[PDB]
Design a protein around this ligand. Structure first.
Ligand SMILES: [Mg+2]
Lengths: 266, 91, 271, 84, 199, 244, 66
């Protein structure tokens, strides 16, 4: 439990570490006494307890702030059909359409994860690393949040060719087989790219087009919808809205993975 | 005593913050420091040199609209009034 | 006993304010217990009145219990004397208020029912209007001040001073005395004693100056307050009849039950 | 009035002006020389200044703006250019 | 529908205003709604607005005008100061009735500064508090002016200023005094005029 | 929203209360109504604010040093206290004091027995808590168990809000000197909030509020109620509350 | 239920006043928005005075117990 701790003697008081363990014992048992908290938003739970796509309502998309679009002065008019109206100098995104597009994109993610394809989560804004990492880890996927090297797909040999590759079985169990240099040198292209900030990631979108990779993206009021295969109209500027949508997609991928493992265990 | 510029006089009846007791407040105040700015037609003051001597320079040069801050129409009317006043022996 | 009241009698209710068991537990049991403990505290419980006990033994750590129990008896007696019961339905027939009562908005700034002037107390009405702006303001402040007390305490209408200059509302907690002259300056005197003890063995200047000047009156040292009314905020009076959620209902019944005759009868003339 | 600019090749200040804090030594020296001009040379009326001067110049006789960086960093974001 | 929820949403609850965020005139009362965030949301730059607020902002309070602008920023100031003035007034205890029984835009009574009713005494371990003592700062040589609890008040003396006043001069504000807040009314402009006396 | 916790064996608690302490209508008054009342008031006092995300213990620690939030503190304290008390009188989730608890009693209360310390607690509650309050047996950082009596909604965790002295009535010079020392120690803290460290934790909690005993005992007889509480503690909980 | 102003899970602020006003309008208890708004205003004052007295008395009672 707690090795390399030397207790104190009964004559002498608690030490600092003993006080720490004592208040931990208090925290896990009695600190939470008095009342249970209900109907209160906790930011971490969007990442670790995202809902299923079928359980998402317009109200939960709105509470996440997905409906809040860009300033009307920065409108890209090709997004006209996604807009519900303008209010307080910004465009409001039609959350019914957001929900429909989100369910479609979630089903695409689930289908690709169920087929054993590679899923890549791209988001290069400040505090998006946690959600991207968790989405990748629960989908058995991959993510980038630091920077998209231009040419990562169309110039994969010069960029990603050196990093290591691995053979895996139907259950995603490492086989630990020795790969040939030729096999190691091949391109390993994602089967699905999901980008949280497509306006600042035009390079990735264009590479996906050239490399012929279907893509999902959160499309704000200033973003070009036609640059992605499966748009999701929504706010790409709020970490809460982005993490809500990302967690939904990650859970859909997790369900696809669970189904794949289930049939591979039968 | 200290120079009045370096000090800040908090007015009476006004709320304040601790920031107001600082050089930042004075500096922010420096950086962020009438009859014609109204429905009145300046062309009715062409016979009133005192009023429209406020919108000229010490030598009598009409002030640019950047200075006067008037609307384009009232700048044009004021310039017309000043020139007419100069012509009719006033001003 | 010297504590006994006239309009309160065993086996009867206080009309719409208390029920038989409610009054039994609010008044008779409590007075019995306080007497049975004050007798233990001292034998003067009958030799001398209550206010003499409260004042003579004041500021005494050793005689703390005499002061506590005499004060509590006197406050409770005052509070229950000022009342006469109301016409509203008896508290035992009415259903007990539940959690929803917490969400009701009070109407103390919209409606008022029982006023001094209605019963013929023009002088009390005028004094209250001069002191609290209006009767509705007075009722709001009184009821809110008593409702805000979490535990044991009283809310006192009090005339500052026999002449009164201005009326006020004061709160006492755990058998505190509405009178101020007896206990004023106590902590300052204890601080002086503590500092002298230290000398035998500036923060002093600031602390003592602030204490004395705060307790300093207007062109005087001792400021006395004369009780006029008392409302008991203790759970012991309203729990039995009104339940956990019914303190505000109890206070509204109390307001409807006040007898302003006695309150005007207690007014210190005028300055 | 608002005067919006066309798309610029850059957003740069040619010669950014900085906070040149004045040297304490020179201020003390000027005050001391003023004192000697008014109250006479080697006057006792500002020996303190002399002391202070001696204390401040004893070891050493004498006792950059970032606007361009932030302007270049933020120009594309704030310029209000229409979308491509 | 989405429109009804938007009308009821928390952003919609904040009344529209475009008053300057860097006003340098006279401040009699708040002009901007203070926006607060919990520590957990602040850690993730989440404020319930459109866009994530920059990480430089460590304070949990701000005021804002526009959710988004042509400059691709939110116009905000990381300040929630006017709440501390109000609370400090609540600490003073001095009270300031239209709160008792087509549209009028004038401030009603106190504009929410205080809801305390006039006549009540503050019991204390010493005894009933006769008068309210508060720390403050004399401002300038002038009824003098004092900065007390976020408000500028009028100081009246018992007999005359002490020697410390003219000894310090324009540095008089550096030292803390004790004041008795005599009274506090509010004028038509919305400004509170407390009258105090130095002690 | 703050919601009243669900207790183990709630049906039996609503049907027959707590055996040997409370009837059904007594436990309903002290828990199913008082705790609901307190949780509703806390929700109304903290909704739309940061404190709504915190448990009552964390709320009372956060608001303990802020004078104007005292009402919230009171609520957050009573709620917490009211569940510390109920938890250690519930029939179950024959329990006996552990060897460690009795050992610490012998090392704290001058080598006295547990029953003697119980009688001392009866006496302490009888005298130093006039009206509403709480009785605690608490452990300090010195591994010392001592009896603490708070008035109204004082907390056992944070000594500047113990409220162990009634300043409405006269106090001894010893108590005044204690208050002076505590005030000086509070001033000794460097943190701008003015808080201090206090590692005291409650081992036993008894509710001396009228919501607990008044219906089943009467205006007097609170000593009988406290005796019934201390003779019928849930010693599994009380033993778990002591650090091993 | 906007038949009352206080709601569990909400603070007391201007939105309580305005939601109560809208409720009063849609139930036709008042015909004019001005009168409904004034009624909501006075309920809001009633609740605010209670809250402020609660705070002040809580602090006073806290100081009286050390
Ligand atoms: Mg965007």
């Amino acid at each position: 439990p707690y090795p390399n701790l030397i207790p104190s003697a009964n004559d002498k008081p608690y030490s600092s570490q003993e006080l720490f363990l004592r208040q931990l014992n208090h925290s896990m048992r009695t600190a939470k006494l008095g009342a249970t908290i209900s109907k209160v938003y906790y930011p971490h739970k969007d990442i670790f307890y995202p809902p299923l796509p079928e359980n998402i309502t317009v109200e939960s998309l709105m509470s996440a702030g997905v409906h809040l679009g860009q300033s009307t002065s920065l409108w890209r008019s090709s997004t006209q059909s996604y807009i519900y109206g303008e209010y307080k100098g910004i465009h409001i995104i039609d959350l019914n359409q957001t929900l429909s597009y989100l369910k479609r994109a979630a089903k695409v993610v689930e289908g690709v994860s169920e087929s054993g394809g590679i899923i890549l989560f791209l988001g290069t804004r400040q505090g998006q690393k946690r959600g991207l990492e968790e989405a990748a880890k629960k989908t058995h996927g991959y993510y980038v949040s630091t920077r998209w090297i231009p040419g990562t797909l169309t110039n994969s040999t010069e960029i990603s060719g050196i990093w290591e590759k691995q053979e895996i079985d139907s259950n995603d169990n490492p086989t630990e087989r020795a790969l040939s240099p030729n096999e190691t040198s091949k391109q390993v292209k994602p089967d699905l790219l999901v980008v949280l900030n497509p306006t600042e990631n035009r390079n990735a979108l264009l590479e996906a087009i050239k490399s012929r990779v279907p893509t999902i993206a959160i499309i704000d009021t200033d973003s070009e919808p036609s640059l992605v295969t499966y748009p999701i109209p929504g706010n790409d500027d709020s970490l809460r809205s982005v993490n809500f949508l990302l967690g939904v997609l990650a859970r859909a991928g997790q369900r696809g993975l669970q189904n794949r493992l289930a049939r591979n265990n039968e | 005593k200290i120079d009045q510029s370096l000090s800040k006089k908090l007015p009476k009846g006004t709320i304040y913050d601790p920031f107001d007791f600082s050089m930042g407040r004075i500096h922010l105040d420096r950086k962020y420091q009438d009859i014609m700015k109204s429905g009145a037609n300046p062309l009715e003051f062409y016979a009133r040199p005192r009023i429209l001597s406020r919108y000229v320079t010490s030598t009598g040069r009409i002030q640019h609209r950047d200075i006067t801050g008037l609307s384009a129409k009232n700048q044009r009317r004021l310039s017309k009034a000043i020139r007419r006043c100069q012509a009719i022996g006033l001003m | 006993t010297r504590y006994a009241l006239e309009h309160l009698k065993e086996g009867a209710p206080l009309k719409g304010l208390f029920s038989i068991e409610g009054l039994q537990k609010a008044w008779f049991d409590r007075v019995k217990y306080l007497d049975a403990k004050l007798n233990d505290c001292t034998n003067e419980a009958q030799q001398k009145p209550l206010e003499t006990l409260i004042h003579e033994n004041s500021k005494s750590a050793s005689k703390k219990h005499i002061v506590n129990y005499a004060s509590s008896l006197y406050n409770l007696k005052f509070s229950m004397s000022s009342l006469q019961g109301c016409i509203r339905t008896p508290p035992e027939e009415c259903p007990r208020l539940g959690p929803e009562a917490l969400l009701q908005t009070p109407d103390f700034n919209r409606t008022i029912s029982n006023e001094p002037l209605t019963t013929g107390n023009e002088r009390l009405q005028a004094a209250l209007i001069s002191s609290f702006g209006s009767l509705m303001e007075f009722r709001t402040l009184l009821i809110n001040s008593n409702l805000a007390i979490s535990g044991d305490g009283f809310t006192w209408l009090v005339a500052r001073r026999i002449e009164y200059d201005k009326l006020f509302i004061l709160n006492t907690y755990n058998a505190g005395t509405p009178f101020n002259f007896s206990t004023s300056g106590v902590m300052n005197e204890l601080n002086n004693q503590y500092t002298n003890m230290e000398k035998q063995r500036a923060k002093q200047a600031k602390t003592k100056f602030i204490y004395e000047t705060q307790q300093k009156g207007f062109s005087g040292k001792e400021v006395s307050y004369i009780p006029l009314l008392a409302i008991d905020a203790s759970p012991k009076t309203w729990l039995t009849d009104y339940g956990v959620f019914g303190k505000r209902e109890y206070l509204e019944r109390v307001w409807d039950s006040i007898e302003w005759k006695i309150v005007e009868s207690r007014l210190p003339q005028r300055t | 009035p608002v005067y919006r600019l066309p798309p610029l090749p850059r957003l740069k200040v040619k010669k950014p002006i900085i906070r040149q804090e004045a040297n304490k030594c020179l201020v003390l020296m000027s005050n001391l020389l003023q004192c000697w001009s008014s109250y006479g040379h080697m006057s006792p009326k500002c020996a303190g200044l002399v002391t202070e001067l001696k204390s401040c110049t004893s070891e050493s006789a004498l006792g950059k703006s970032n606007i361009n960086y932030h302007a270049a960093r933020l120009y594309d974001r704030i310029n209000g250019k229409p979308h491509d | 529908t989405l429109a009804e929820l938007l009308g009821r949403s928390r952003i919609a609850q904040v009344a529209n205003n475009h008053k300057p965020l860097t006003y340098t005139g006279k401040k009699f009362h708040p002009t901007h709604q203070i926006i607060e965030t919990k520590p957990s949301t602040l850690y993730r730059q989440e404020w319930g607005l459109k866009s994530a607020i920059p990480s430089k902002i460590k304070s949990r309070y701000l005021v804002y005008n526009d959710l988004d602008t042509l400059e691709r920023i939110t116009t905000f100031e990381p300040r929630g100061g006017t709440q501390w003035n109000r609370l400090r007034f609540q600490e003073m205890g001095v009270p300031i009735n239209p709160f008792f029984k087509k549209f009028n835009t004038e401030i009603i009574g106190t504009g929410g500064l205080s809801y305390s009713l006039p006549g009540k005494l503050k019991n204390s371990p010493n005894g009933v508090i006769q008068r309210t003592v508060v720390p403050g700062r004399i401002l300038n040589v002038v009824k003098w002016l004092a900065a007390i609890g976020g408000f500028v008040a009028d100081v009246v003396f018992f007999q005359s200023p002490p020697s410390s006043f003219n000894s310090m001069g324009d540095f008089i504000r550096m030292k803390t005094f004790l004041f008795e807040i005599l009274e506090a009314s509010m004028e038509k402009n919305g400004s509170v005029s407390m009258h105090a006396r130095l002690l | 929203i703050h919601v009243v916790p669900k207790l183990p064996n709630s049906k039996a608690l609503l049907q027959n209360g707590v055996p040997n302490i409370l009837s059904s209508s007594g436990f309903k008054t002290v828990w199913f109504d008082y705790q609901r009342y307190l949780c509703d008031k806390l929700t109304l006092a903290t909704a739309g604010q940061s404190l709504e995300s915190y448990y009552p213990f964390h709320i009372l620690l956060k608001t303990a040093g802020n004078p104007l939030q005292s009402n919230i503190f009171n609520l957050a304290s009573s709620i917490h206290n009211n569940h510390l008390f109920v938890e250690n009188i519930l029939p179950s989730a024959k329990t006996e004091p552990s060897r460690l608890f009795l050992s610490k009693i012998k090392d704290s209360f001058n080598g006295s027995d547990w029953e003697v310390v119980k009688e001392e607690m009866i006496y302490r509650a009888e005298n130093e808590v006039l009206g509403q309050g709480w009785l605690f047996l608490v452990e300090n950082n010195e591994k010392k168990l001592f009896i603490l009596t708070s008035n109204n909604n004082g907390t056992p965790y944070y000594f500047p809000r113990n409220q162990s002295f009634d300043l409405n009535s006269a106090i001894s010079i010893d108590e005044f000197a204690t208050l002076k020392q505590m005030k000086e120690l509070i001033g000794k803290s460097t943190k701008l909030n003015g808080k201090v460290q206090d590692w005291t934790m409650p081992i036993i909690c008894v509710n001396l509020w009228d919501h607990a005993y008044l219906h089943d005992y009467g205006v007097g007889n609170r000593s009988k109620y406290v005796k019934n509480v201390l003779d019928n503690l849930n010693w599994s909980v009380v033993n778990n509350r002591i650090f091993s | 239920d906007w038949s009352h102003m206080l709601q569990i899970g909400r603070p007391l602020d201007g939105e309580s006043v305005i939601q109560r006003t809208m409720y009063l309008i849609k139930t036709k208890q008042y015909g004019d928005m001005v009168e409904a708004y004034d009624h909501a205003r006075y309920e809001f004052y009633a609740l605010r005075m209670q809250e402020e007295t609660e705070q002040q008395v809580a602090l006073e009672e806290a100081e009286m117990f050390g």
